[PDB]
Structure 1
Amino acid sequence: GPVPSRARVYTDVNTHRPSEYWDYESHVVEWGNQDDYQLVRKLGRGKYSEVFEAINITNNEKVVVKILKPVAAAKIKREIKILENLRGGPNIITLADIVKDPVSRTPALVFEHVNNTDFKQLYQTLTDYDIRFYMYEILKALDYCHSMGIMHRDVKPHNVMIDHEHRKLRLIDWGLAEFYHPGQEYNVRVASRYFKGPELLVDYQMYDYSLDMWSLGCMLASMIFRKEPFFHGHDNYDQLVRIAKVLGTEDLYDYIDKYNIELDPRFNDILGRHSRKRWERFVHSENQHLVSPEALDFLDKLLRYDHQSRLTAREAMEHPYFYTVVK
């Protein structure tokens, strides 16, 4: 059987809290008035929700309305509890109201306005200074939710909203977010393909906050090397092969050895044998101005197979890469 694993930080935050904090099923939703919000335009549709630009007609302030699809409606209380627990946190989206949509008859989450601009729209355009600045702002959010005993589990460019003109950032879509309980086995079908950690890809269920640090590392690698996405798998199996072509197969076998994981035998015909690549392999004339010894050292410490060997959000914020950022 697999060897158990525990978070090296904020391990017991929820164990010490009263049940009310993490027992989301016991939470009683104070339903608002759906009439207060007039939908303006559909911003997008995912497999679990529909997002709209809206106006709170009473105060004329712009808001964002997220309407849950029937498939996601069942986990409404988890997302509400997390959003309320984190409200006021640095760079975390602010929940303004919870209403029952009259058409879908599913819950609708109302958020204070943030720019329609995803980080995906800008992150391949940033200077060396701005990559550092924005990565620090993201770290602020991650360290805060981790310190509050929450894992985001869907860190990706589409889940970061940016107001570049006003140097403002918000970490959004807390729909897959979960409370960390030590020893708990979680669902590996979380995060988007390109941002999935090796723990997910090898089916190791006893993961923690460090999952978010891998996802952040993928985002950094894509920004500094101008390669969208950095690990470009055709499916979840090929995703592990793409990572192994960079990090090597020897450290992957060491990782699975350490946690006594049994790799899906389909990997025997595609994984092959690969040496760890030096990061300078990914440097070229177009991205060299974004690459520094500090950036590469920082990336090296995020993109590790062993989820326990990855920098934590706080340790990441202490990194020399962030010394040039005004604090």
Structure 2
Amino acid sequence: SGPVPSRARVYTDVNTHRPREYWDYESHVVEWGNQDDYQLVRKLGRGKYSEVFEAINITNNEKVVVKILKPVKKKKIKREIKILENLRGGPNIITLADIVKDPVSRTPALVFEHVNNTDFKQLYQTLTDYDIRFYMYEILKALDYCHSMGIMHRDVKPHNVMIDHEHRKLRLIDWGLAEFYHPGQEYNVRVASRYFKGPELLVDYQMYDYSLDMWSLGCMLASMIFRKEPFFHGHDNYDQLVRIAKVLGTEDLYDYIDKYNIELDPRFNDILGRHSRKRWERFVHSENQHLVSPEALDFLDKLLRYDHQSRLTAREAMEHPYFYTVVKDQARMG
């Protein structure tokens, strides 16, 4: 027999209940705007998939952000546009304002509402324990919405989380790897960055779901509260799972491989070897603490599970005692 199928615990049939036009991005007709309504002001940086620019909308004098995408297949740009349009207005999710093509180069470019040029990886060292609790909850707000909209991000990492620390506003960006979730659909395992890949990707289990983002988020919290970036520092894809096994242990990893009947490489089992589960208190040291708390380690333990179905959902995570005072302070201050 082959690999045992899996289903998302929550938001399983959200795309099934919605009409076909919601998730069938291949059938969607992209309505392009005019690039002449936007002028590039300055350069904000460069990514491995695009080049981000600061721009101005000359029709309403509004500041925007233009993302000139590098050449890519036409089905990926339509998927990202449809996902961004379906997530417009969502909390802590970037707001796609327009989509344009160069009149000569014909290369597509995404236009978003203005967000400051400061990501989470640039501030996680200068933030207190409550500030990482607050921003982690804001990330969960954006993850629960897109999951409830039947959309996996599949590239959660500190660089894709923009922070406007003056205004306490957070935005989850880079939706180029996002994909609609459909029960029983096998997805591509070449998603996310190596340090943030879930074990389902490292063992080539293709029927994953929203819970992949929860693992990536678990690696982000572990990197911050322990001040070790990245937390799982694998040098290749095999070593990434080894680095994970040296922390969670090989016992729960093999019981995860046999649970879904995953066929690993015969030499991969000899590479993983046998490792005991290391308690989270062994990475506390003395400087990176004060960011560590019993509810933090318990919250981290419930995110970094081998079994994707055993991880916490974004909603269940938002109700963990790690955010108890955060949700109490948010409900009275805004």
Q: Is the 8 A contact 1:96 1:110 kept in 2?
A: yes
Q: Is the 8 A contact 1:73 1:107 kept in 2?
A: no
Q: Offset at 1:63?
A: 1.1
Q: Is the 8 A contact 2:101 2:109 kept in 1?
A: yes
1:149-192 CA distance string (max 9 Å, x none): 11110000111000011111001111111110000000000001
Mapped to 1, the partners of 2:127 and 2:174 lie a distance apart of 23
Mapped to 2, the partners of 1:81 and 1:300 lie a distance apart of 34
Q: Offset at 1:45?
A: 2.9
Distance 1:219 1:72, change over 3 A: farther
Q: Is the 8 A contact 2:8 2:211 kept in 1?
A: yes
Q: Is the 8 A contact 1:10 1:147 kept in 2?
A: yes
Q: Secondary structure at the match of 2:166?
A: helix
Provide structure 1 residue ranges, at least 5 long, that are not aligned to the other structure.
Answer: none
Mapped to 1, the partners of 2:29 and 2:133 lie a distance apart of 40
1:202 counterpart residue number: 203
1:257-307 CA distance string (max 9 Å, x none): 101001123324432211000011001110120000000000000000000
Q: Is the 8 A contact 2:156 2:217 kept in 1?
A: yes
1:77-122 CA distance string (max 9 Å, x none): 1111111111111101000000002454221110000011011101
Distance 1:54 1:265, change over 3 A: farther
Deviates more, 1:209-218 or 1:9-18: 9-18
Moved >2 Å (runs of 4+) = 40-48, 57-61, 71-74, 101-104
Q: Is the 8 A contact 2:202 2:237 kept in 1?
A: yes
Distance 1:117 1:228, change over 3 A: same
2:62 counterpart residue number: 61
Q: Secondary structure at the match of 2:104?
A: coil
2:156 counterpart residue number: 155
Q: Secondary structure at the match of 2:112?
A: strand
Q: Is the 8 A contact 2:200 2:208 kept in 1?
A: yes
Aligned residue pairs, count: 327
Provide structure 2 residue ranges, at least 5 long, that are not aligned to the other structure.
Answer: 329-334
Q: Offset at 1:43?
A: 2.6
Q: Offset at 1:68?
A: 1.6
Mapped to 1, the partners of 2:272 and 2:123 lie a distance apart of 34
Q: Offset at 1:11?
A: 0.6
Q: Is the 8 A contact 2:232 2:243 kept in 1?
A: yes
1:239 counterpart residue number: 240
Q: Is the 8 A contact 1:151 1:180 kept in 2?
A: yes
Mapped to 1, the partners of 2:266 and 2:100 lie a distance apart of 47
Mapped to 1, the partners of 2:206 and 2:305 lie a distance apart of 17
1:85 counterpart residue number: 86
Deviates more, 1:29-38 or 1:307-316: 29-38
1:188 counterpart residue number: 189
TM-score (norm 2): 0.95
Identity among equivalent positions (%) equals 99
Q: Is the 8 A contact 1:49 1:72 kept in 2?
A: no
Q: Offset at 1:326?
A: 4.4
Q: Offset at 1:49?
A: 1.8
